[PDB]
Amino acid sequence: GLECDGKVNICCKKQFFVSFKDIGWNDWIIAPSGYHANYCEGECPSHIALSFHSTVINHYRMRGHSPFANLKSCCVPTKLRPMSMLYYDDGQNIIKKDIQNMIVEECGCS
């Protein structure tokens, strides 16, 4: 997908870093101190809309056949990566775990 700069208008990935200290989560997250979560922003006009399932919806959208005639496309993550994390749990044990769905790696039009 596209990486947002300040020029591209269409759906892209915006770099976004989050400190656990700044948001007050470091009391239970020991490590890492922060990471690039990222997010998706941007337009999804007709001339673009894994896209495989979305593409077939888009092909149906190309005729006024009416579930998809109205269905607006959205810029959303199309790929997420996990990340290793150390944290306190309910019994306050320190746990090490590969946490799924932590980083947005790519964005796309639904």
Ligand X SMILES: CCC[C@]1(C)C(=O)Nc2ccccc2C(=O)N1CC
Judged by beta carbon distances under 5 to 8 A according to partner kind, the member of ligand X, a copy of itself, none in contact with residue 29 is: ligand X
For residue 105, give the amino acid letter: E
Q: Which two tokens stand for residue 54?
A: 């979305």
Does 13 participate in binding a copy of itself (rule CB under 8 A)?
A: yes
Choosing from 59, 84, 95, 96, the residue that interacts with a copy of itself (CB under 8 A) is 59
Choosing from 2, 10, 29, 76, the residue that interacts with ligand X (CB under 6 A) is 29
Q: Which two tokens stand for residue 99?
A: 């946490």
Does 87 participate in binding ligand X (rule CB under 6 A)?
A: yes
User: What is the separation of C-alpha 45 from the centre of its chain, rounded to a whole number of angstroms?
Assistant: 19
Q: How far is CA 17 from CA 48, 63, 107, 109, in A?
A: 28, 41, 17, 23
Secondary element (H or E) of residue 52:
helix 51-61
Chain positions contacting a copy of itself, by CB under 8 A: 1-3, 8-10, 13, 16, 18, 22-25, 27-28, 37, 39-41, 43, 45-48, 50-54, 56-57, 59-60, 67-68, 71-72, 74, 76-77, 80, 88, 90, 92-93, 99-104, 106, 110
